[PDB]
């Protein structure tokens, strides 16, 4: 009968999968309402602690899934730029279930948006450093050259100007220039 406890876990898990679709809900509320469902007794072998554990894992799973689909939706919205605001973006994606079902909380959507943009920014810098390492007009002597005059940095920016990786940073001009400077230093 050892498998009976394992069977109860899977039963309780199926109950959660069926009845809890939102990551916003509390265990307190959920254990209240699920108790009204006759399927609840099928978890009798499970102590409240392990039920609550299973609930937490479930919320964790929903959270991960929703975040991934949210980010996919953002990745699919081509109007988004490094400088886009949640306020602007919300207007575009408002009807998409991946936005709607992410959470009832605007704060949590906004926060996930700002985190997405941060990651997007981080990824773009990494790619840009790759491009920089590819460019052999940029040498140990570049730093000499940069301190002597405006020219070298302009010459560099000319060579880089048409590359996909340089251009995705158009929204953060000062930042990009710093990256070039940083690479010229090291
Ligand atoms: Ni047995």
Curated annotation (Swiss-Prot):
Protein origin, superkingdom: Eukaryota
- In this chain the FF domain maps to 5-61, 63-119, 121-186
As for subcellular location, the record says: Nucleus
Tissue specificity note: Detected in brain neurons.
Stated induction or repression of this protein's expression: Up-regulated in brain tissue from patients with Huntington disease.
Residues bearing Phosphoserine? 42
Q: How does it assemble?
A: Binds formin. Interacts (via the second WW domain) with TREX1 (via proline-rich region). Binds RNA polymerase II, HD and SF1.
Fill in the domain comment: The FF domains bind the phosphorylated C-terminus of the largest subunit of RNA polymerase II, probably mediate interaction with HTATSF1 and preferentially bind peptides with the consensus sequence [DE](2-5)-[FWY]-[DE](2-5). The WW domains bind Pro-rich domains.
Describe the task this protein carries out: Transcription factor that binds RNA polymerase II and inhibits the elongation of transcripts from target promoters. Regulates transcription elongation in a TATA box-dependent manner. Necessary for TAT-dependent activation of the human immunodeficiency virus type 1 (HIV-1) promoter.
Write the protein's name: Transcription elongation regulator 1
